Structure 1
Amino acid sequence: ASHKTFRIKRFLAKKQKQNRPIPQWIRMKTGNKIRYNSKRRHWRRTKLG
């Protein structure tokens, strides 16, 4: 909704900044141990609650 509280908007701001894929140089660091961001969420298939 357009009507948001500051806590909800601050909560959605954090989840919006975590929905970024891993940097490419991370796979060169850990030896391809972390291949992808397993915590990527889509706005349709998984909701926040």
Structure 2
Amino acid sequence: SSHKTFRIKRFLAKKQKQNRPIPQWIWMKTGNKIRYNSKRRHWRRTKLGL
């Protein structure tokens, strides 16, 4: 599907900028209980909806 639309392209840009893991100081703060991002996503196991 390379005949897209723009509302779709913005939707497949947000779910692309929501994929990277945490910076290493983010679990350097004081009130941290976060060890890894648990909301990641791989394109073979799940299919995003749509």
TM-score when normalising by structure 2? 0.86
RMSD of Structure 2 on Structure 1 (CA):
1.3
* Percent of aligned pairs with the same amino acid: 96
Q: Runs ≥4 in structure 1, deviation > 6 angstroms?
A: none
Which has the larger helix fraction? 1
Deviation at residue 29 of structure 1 after TM alignment: 1.1
Q: Aligned pair count?
A: 49
**Unmatched tracts of structure 1, length 5 or more:** none
Cα gap change, 1:5 to 1:19, in 2 (>3 Å): same
Task: After TM superposition, give the deviation of residue 6 of structure 1 in Å.
Answer: 0.4
